[PDB]
Amino acid sequence: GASKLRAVLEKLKLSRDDISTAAGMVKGVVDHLLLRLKCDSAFRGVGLLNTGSYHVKISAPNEFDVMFKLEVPRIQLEEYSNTRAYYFVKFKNPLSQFLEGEILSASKMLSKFRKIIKEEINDIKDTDVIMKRKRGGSPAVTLLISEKISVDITLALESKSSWPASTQEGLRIQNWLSAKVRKQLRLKPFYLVPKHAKQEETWRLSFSHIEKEILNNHGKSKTCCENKEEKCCRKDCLKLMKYLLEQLKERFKDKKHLDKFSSYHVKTAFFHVCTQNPQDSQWDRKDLGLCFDNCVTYFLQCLRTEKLENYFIPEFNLFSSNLIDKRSKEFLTKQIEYERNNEFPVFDE
Numbered sequence: 001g002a003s004k005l006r007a008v009l010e011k012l013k014l015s016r017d018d019i020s021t022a023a024g025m026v027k028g029v030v031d032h033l034l035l036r037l038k039c040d041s042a043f044r045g046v047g048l049l050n051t052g053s054y055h056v057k058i059s060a061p062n063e064f065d066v067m068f069k070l071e072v073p074r075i076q077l078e079e080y081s082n083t084r085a086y087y088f089v090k091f092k093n094p095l096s097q098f099l100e101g102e103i104l105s106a107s108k109m110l111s112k113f114r115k116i117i118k119e120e121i122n123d124i125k126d127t128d129v130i131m132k133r134k135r136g137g138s139p140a141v142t143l144l145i146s147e148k149i150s151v152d153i154t155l156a157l158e159s160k161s162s163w164p165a166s167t168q169e170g171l172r173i174q175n176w177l178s179a180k181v182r183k184q185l186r187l188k189p190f191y192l193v194p195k196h197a198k199q200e201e202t203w204r205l206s207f208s209h210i211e212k213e214i215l216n217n218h219g220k221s222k223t224c225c226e227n228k229e230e231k232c233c234r235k236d237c238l239k240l241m242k243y244l245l246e247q248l249k250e251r252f253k254d255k256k257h258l259d260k261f262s263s264y265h266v267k268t269a270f271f272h273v274c275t276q277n278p279q280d281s282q283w284d285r286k287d288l289g290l291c292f293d294n295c296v297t298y299f300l301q302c303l304r305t306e307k308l309e310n311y312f313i314p315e316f317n318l319f320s321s322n323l324i325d326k327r328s329k330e331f332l333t334k335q336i337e338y339e340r341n342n343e344f345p346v347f348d349e
């Protein structure tokens with residue numbers, strides 16, 4: 001049981017250099033775009049947000065996520081219709097061209113963003129890239145690099161203001177990472193990505209920079225995982241949870257039953273389990289089997305109760321029916337429940 005999970009992690013390490021070399025060209029292309037974008041007055045202050053293990057984030061087997069941040073001077077937010085996560089953007093400048101009255105148009109800003117990138121990909125066709133526009137608005141643009149590697153590029157407005165009121169009861173890390181750290185983290189900027197709600201000129205809050213920071217400095221002890229005496233299995237548990245969902249989606253690709261589920265749901269439930277299990281002694285590497293069952297069991301509870309709170313916006317249920325069919329949640333409950341009750345045969349060789 002424990003050795004089966006260690007074998008999965010060892011197998012996942014086998015592609016460590018196939019995803020390290022892929023991201024090395026993603027970073028090549030992305031820095032190419034970052035300059036062209038800086039020639040435009042609206043995106044002059046654009047920069048790469050630190051969101052991944054490489055600016056380059058990996059959320060799939062071999063497909064990448066990159067965010068472009070844009071320092072937007074003092075912003076005023078108006079919450080869209082009690083959604084707690086979707087907002088209109090206003091001011092109190094080079095983004096003047098994108099207003100529709102007092103509101104910043106996301107679709108307008110997004111469109112010029114695309115026009116700039118589709119020209120850069122096509123003009124220097126001397127680099128083998130094309131782009132397929134996905135449906136979310138986030139991701140803004142998807143680039144296929146040599147018909148194998150995929151990179152999602154997200155535009156995001158940076159606000160150095162205090163976090164909006166919907167987050168004031170979120171980031172419940174006080175018993176785990178401390179109140180000192182929670183105060184430090186909430187003095188950092190927050191981001192807004194163009195996302196329509198289910199359509200409008202709305203923006204959605206994003207804290208992927210905070211997520212990376214609490215994954216890479218994840219212990220109650222400041223020296224967690226910096227020496228042989230303090231090796232926890234937090235990151236391994238999150239890896240196995242992502243891989244469990246990835247493998248299940250493959251198995252049920254015949255009907256795409258599980259297509260509404262995302263590694264973000266798995267990552268969100270894993271942060272709630274860290275809150276629930278705050279001591280590094282609850283994540284001792286030798287207890288991997290038990291720590292993974294703790295993660296799986298909480299995710300099942302979320303599926304069965306149809307409630308997975310956003311870690312930063314607790315009134316935003318990622319598992320609400322507005323977002324995910326009741327039939328799909330019940331489906332995945334049954335499949336994860338089977339996997340757990342039988343020592344995860346999806347991990348068999």
Ligand SMILES: O=C(O)c1cc(-c2ccccc2O)nc2c(Cl)cccc12
Nearest residue numbers: 085204205206207208262264310316318
């Ligand atoms: O960038 C982020 O922090 C981020 C936020 C959210 C989110 C935020 C508010 C309400 C609902 C959401 O689903 N979803 C994400 C997904 Cl699904 C994938 C990757 C990143 C994110």
Ligand SMILES: [Zn+2]
Nearest residue numbers: 219224225232
């Ligand atoms: Zn650790």
